[PDB]
Design an enzyme around this catalytic site. Structure first.
Site, short mmCIF file in Angstrom:
data_model
loop_
_atom_site.label_atom_id
_atom_site.label_comp_id
_atom_site.label_asym_id
_atom_site.label_seq_id
_atom_site.Cartn_x
_atom_site.Cartn_y
_atom_site.Cartn_z
N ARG A 176 3.52 -13.74 0.00
CA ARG A 176 3.69 -12.39 0.51
C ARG A 176 2.90 -11.45 -0.39
O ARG A 176 3.32 -11.17 -1.51
CB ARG A 176 5.18 -12.02 0.51
CG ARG A 176 5.60 -10.55 0.43
CD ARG A 176 5.42 -9.77 1.72
NE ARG A 176 6.23 -10.38 2.77
CZ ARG A 176 6.08 -10.20 4.06
NH1 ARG A 176 5.26 -9.26 4.49
NH2 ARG A 176 6.76 -10.91 4.94
N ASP B 85 12.37 -11.01 18.71
CA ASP B 85 11.26 -11.84 18.26
C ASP B 85 11.73 -13.27 18.04
O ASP B 85 11.06 -14.21 18.43
CB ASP B 85 10.61 -11.23 17.02
CG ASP B 85 9.27 -11.80 16.58
OD1 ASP B 85 8.35 -11.87 17.42
OD2 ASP B 85 9.16 -12.17 15.39
N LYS C 75 0.82 -1.20 0.00
CA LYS C 75 0.00 0.00 0.00
C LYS C 75 0.87 1.26 0.00
O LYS C 75 0.35 2.35 -0.20
CB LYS C 75 -1.01 0.00 1.16
CG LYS C 75 -1.60 -1.35 1.59
N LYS D 50 11.06 -3.58 16.38
CA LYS D 50 10.90 -4.32 15.14
C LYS D 50 9.94 -3.64 14.16
O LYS D 50 10.12 -3.87 12.97
CB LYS D 50 10.36 -5.72 15.44
CG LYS D 50 10.31 -6.65 14.24
CD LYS D 50 9.73 -8.00 14.58
CE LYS D 50 9.25 -8.68 13.38
NZ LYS D 50 9.14 -10.12 13.64
N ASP E 155 11.30 -17.05 8.11
CA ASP E 155 10.07 -17.67 8.57
C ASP E 155 9.65 -18.88 7.73
O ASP E 155 8.70 -19.55 8.09
CB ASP E 155 8.87 -16.76 8.41
CG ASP E 155 8.91 -15.53 9.29
OD1 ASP E 155 9.71 -15.55 10.25
OD2 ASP E 155 8.16 -14.57 8.98
N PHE F 150 -1.27 0.28 16.65
CA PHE F 150 -1.68 -0.35 15.40
C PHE F 150 -1.27 -1.81 15.33
O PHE F 150 -1.96 -2.61 14.71
CB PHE F 150 -1.14 0.46 14.23
CG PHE F 150 -1.95 1.72 14.00
CD1 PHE F 150 -3.28 1.64 13.60
CD2 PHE F 150 -1.38 2.98 14.13
CE1 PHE F 150 -4.02 2.78 13.37
CE2 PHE F 150 -2.13 4.13 13.89
CZ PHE F 150 -3.44 4.02 13.51
N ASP G 64 12.80 -11.64 6.00
CA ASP G 64 11.91 -12.21 6.99
C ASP G 64 11.28 -13.49 6.44
O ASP G 64 11.16 -14.48 7.15
CB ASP G 64 10.85 -11.23 7.44
CG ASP G 64 9.96 -11.78 8.56
OD1 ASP G 64 10.52 -12.38 9.51
OD2 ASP G 64 8.72 -11.64 8.46
N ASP H 244 -3.58 -4.92 14.87
CA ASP H 244 -3.26 -5.83 13.79
C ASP H 244 -3.35 -7.26 14.33
O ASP H 244 -3.85 -8.16 13.64
CB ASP H 244 -1.86 -5.55 13.30
CG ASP H 244 -1.66 -5.66 11.79
OD1 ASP H 244 -0.93 -4.81 11.26
OD2 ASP H 244 -2.24 -6.58 11.18
N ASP H 245 -2.84 -7.44 15.54
CA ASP H 245 -2.91 -8.72 16.23
C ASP H 245 -4.35 -9.11 16.56
O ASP H 245 -4.70 -10.29 16.52
CB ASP H 245 -2.03 -8.73 17.47
CG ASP H 245 -0.54 -8.74 17.17
OD1 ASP H 245 -0.18 -8.84 15.97
OD2 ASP H 245 0.24 -8.64 18.14
N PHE I 245 13.78 -4.82 1.80
CA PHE I 245 14.90 -5.51 2.43
C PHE I 245 14.44 -6.40 3.59
O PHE I 245 14.74 -7.59 3.62
CB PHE I 245 15.88 -4.44 2.90
CG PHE I 245 16.92 -4.90 3.90
CD1 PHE I 245 17.71 -6.00 3.64
CD2 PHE I 245 17.10 -4.22 5.09
CE1 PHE I 245 18.68 -6.40 4.54
CE2 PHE I 245 18.04 -4.63 6.00
CZ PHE I 245 18.84 -5.71 5.72
#
Ligand SMILES: O=P(O)(O)C(Nc1ncnc2sc(-c3ccc([C@@H]4CC4(F)F)cc3)cc12)P(=O)(O)O
Ligand SMILES: O=P(O)(O)C(Nc1ncnc2sc(-c3ccc([C@@H]4CC4(F)F)cc3)cc12)P(=O)(O)O
Ligand SMILES: O=P(O)(O)C(Nc1ncnc2sc(-c3ccc([C@@H]4CC4(F)F)cc3)cc12)P(=O)(O)O
Ligand SMILES: O=P(O)(O)C(Nc1ncnc2sc(-c3ccc([C@@H]4CC4(F)F)cc3)cc12)P(=O)(O)O
Ligand SMILES: O=P(O)(O)C(Nc1ncnc2sc(-c3ccc([C@@H]4CC4(F)F)cc3)cc12)P(=O)(O)O
Ligand SMILES: O=P(O)(O)C(Nc1ncnc2sc(-c3ccc([C@@H]4CC4(F)F)cc3)cc12)P(=O)(O)O
Lengths: 339, 339
Positions: free
Chosen positions: B104, B166, B49, B190, B99, B229, B95, B233-234, B90
């Site tokens: 994505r 994390d 976005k 993060k 992960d 936020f 990530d 988001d969680d 980047f």
């Protein structure tokens, strides 16, 4: 080397301070990650010969009037020296992941250590981050501050570009793209810039030598030097007595874009190219020995022996023509040490 | 958002120039790697976005007298804006490797594309390198030049530290380390720093607002915003209607350190903690639904609903107290847009 062996002890002692500074807690929240950072530095920045890092210090000594080499100045030289070693560390942690390596300096690659894995990607970036933290802490007030930031950033860009070039060149077995223009180019971006230009240039900047013609001249010498040593390194991979060297060569199994193979490719008959396609890359050693025996058949040593001699004259000529205003002995000192 | 939708078209058009500049050959030797770089940028910087990048431009408009918003100035704002988007790029390439992600933005993660693999590590670093190349090219002569270099470098360090935190926090299933002090800290380093502080601060610097108290005030607002936020988001991960959101949540399967689980952990009876140990992490959905039903049982929504309300008052209060000398509308504009 005397001038390098002189400077070494104090350099390596400084690593304690590097770590102290980089891990020193008004924020308790991040303690654990800082702890992890300590583990990463200790494991990865320690164990090499430190030739790059030391070159910063040796050159600084050679390049500054000794009246201006106070306590503080050398601290900074040690720090900037360690910045190079962190850059190398960053590169190698990541390279080892990308190459799916096991060993690095006869010990387990970081990413292979139980419980690290691809977390090592983050670890590599932390090593790179540490460069700019150290530069800020020890050099923000200095006139050369921005010059070093840019020099390091640029050195990273060039190496990454070179790594891209190498990754494109050597995926899938294809010799068609192993040209000499291409070899010369990988070596230049991926190794020569940060291994030979960077350490001297950081010292030049530290010593107030900031001019572009000055740097262009240093660069011209140092890149051609860098080319020489990589070619040497590629030679000794297969032919060096490994008790002398330290490495046990695997450029043939690994399918790397070695000087040797490039030369072999310019010389082989259509018959021999077929024998090369036939053997380059395999695990099994009967194939690996068929490559070495082909090279030998092509008297590639004499080709190398020839390369060395020409290269000696070219390098000395460049130093004559381009070293001043710098002392010849920064160039020669380094050559002495890397050979 | 009107102010963001206004600025967008010209921003995204600028990406053509970004790429042209970054790929523009006095050296033919590296053409292939530059080609690869183009592929990497096109794939990875495009599709989000662009909220972070746009915030640089919107804020710049809000922060500079319009008499001083010439052709050149906005070019630079677009560029700096794109620098943020490269930083994000980047981070996400890397990530996704770490992960072991597949998708994505509903498309194949770069590293998973046939023939990329762990070469993506190099690719990620190239994206980061591009930031400093762009800064040099478009801003070397500007007074804020060093400030942005340092701001970006720092933003990377903080994020990497947070990523370390994390990775330590969520290897192996262990809730004992999922504390709220620890959650608040991961989010801050993060995500909040580079997502909320960085874009505004780059604009502040661009607009000549370089003072430390100014920045400290902006930071204080922007970090608490960022915390809000992420918690939102969680929340929406599990409870958001995914046709509204865009994401289909998997924080329970993924074993992530979600706000939800932290709260659930402060509330659960010893009985319920056992039920949580019992279900958090599994693929199968009968287990996944047992977690959601536990949260529900704990009226975690009402806890959230409560969090929101308190948070609204706290944030508006901070903006009142700390926004000036900046316009309230940079803060509010962003809130508007991220909600
Ligand atoms: O046998 P290796 O030591 O692994 C050798 N590699 C290198 N040699 C001397 N300097 C560099 S610098 C370098 C390098 C630079 C950047 C990166 C990735 C981009 C990054 F930094 F993340 C990875 C490796 C590799 C590299 P090879 O891979 O050619 O066999
Ligand atoms: O073991 P060595 O005695 O060093 C012998 N070496 C050479 N033999 C015949 N010509 C040359 S010219 C030469 C040489 C060339 C360049 C340089 C470094 C690059 C420079 F010019 F700075 C150093 C030494 C070495 C060299 P070998 O290693 O091939 O067995
Ligand atoms: O019989 P040797 O002398 O051992 C002979 N070696 C050489 N021959 C003709 N020039 C050079 S120059 C040279 C050399 C030059 C520089 C250096 C280091 C860089 C320096 F100049 F400090 C090391 C070796 C060796 C070398 P070989 O073993 O190849 O038959
Ligand atoms: O669901 P994801 O989007 O994958 C989420 N991750 C993030 N979310 C919002 N910002 C960041 S910034 C970030 C990040 C930063 C640095 C790095 C590594 C160090 C580097 F840049 F190389 C990797 C990831 C991840 C990250 P999760 O892993 O918490 O599930
Ligand atoms: O869908 P909504 O109408 O937005 C409703 N939202 C809320 N409900 C009751 N109190 C609050 S207070 C609030 C809020 C708090 C903080 C902020 C942003 C951080 C800030 F202060 F900048 C924005 C909105 C939203 C909010 P729901 O999403 O829970 O269904
Ligand atoms: O009945 P509703 O109004 O839809 C109610 N929502 C709210 N209740 C009390 N305060 C706020 S403040 C709020 C809100 C505030 C700010 C924003 C965006 C950031 C902004 F201020 F621009 C979006 C929503 C929603 C909201 P619900 O659906 O939770 O029952």
């Amino acid at each position: 080397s005397d001038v390098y062996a002189q400077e070494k002890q104090d350099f390596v002692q400084h690593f304690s301070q590097i770590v102290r500074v980089l891990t020193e807690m008004g924020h308790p929240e991040i303690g654990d990650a800082i702890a992890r950072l300590k583990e990463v530095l200790e494991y990865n920045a320690i164990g090499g010969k430190y030739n790059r890092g030391l070159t910063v210090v040796v050159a600084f000594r050679e390049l500054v009037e000794p009246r201006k080499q106070d306590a503080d100045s050398l601290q900074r030289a040690w720090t900037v020296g360690w910045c190079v070693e962190l850059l190398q560390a960053f590169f190698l942690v990541a390279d080892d992941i990308m190459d799916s390596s096991l060993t690095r300096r006869g010990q387990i690659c970081w990413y292979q250590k139980p419980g690290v894995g691809l977390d090592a990607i983050n670890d590599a970036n932390l090593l790179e981050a540490c460069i700019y933290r150290l530069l800020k802490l020890y050099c923000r007030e200095q006139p050369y501050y921005l010059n070093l930031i840019e020099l390091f950033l640029q050195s990273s860009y060039q190496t990454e570009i070179g790594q891209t070039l190498d990754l494109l060149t050597a995926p899938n077995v294809d010799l068609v793209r192993f040209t000499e223009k291409r070899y010369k180019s990988i070596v230049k971006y991926k190794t020569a810039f940060y291994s030979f230009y960077l350490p001297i240039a950081a010292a030049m900047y530290m010593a107030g030598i900031d001019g572009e013609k000055e740097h262009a001249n240093a660069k011209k010498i140092l890149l051609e030097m860098g080319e020489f040593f990589q070619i040497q390194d590629d030679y000794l991979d297969l032919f060096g007595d490994p008790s002398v060297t330290g490495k046990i060569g695997t450029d043939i199994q690994d399918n790397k874009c070695s000087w040797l193979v490039v030369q072999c490719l310019q010389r082989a008959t259509p018959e021999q190219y077929q024998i090369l396609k036939e053997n380059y890359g395999q695990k099994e050693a009967e194939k690996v020995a068929r490559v070495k025996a082909l090279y030998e058949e092509l008297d590639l040593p004499a080709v190398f022996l020839q390369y060395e001699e020409d290269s000696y004259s070219h390098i000395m000529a460049l130093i004559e023509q381009y070293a001043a205003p710098l002392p010849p002995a920064v160039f020669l000192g380094l050559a002495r040490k890397i050979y």
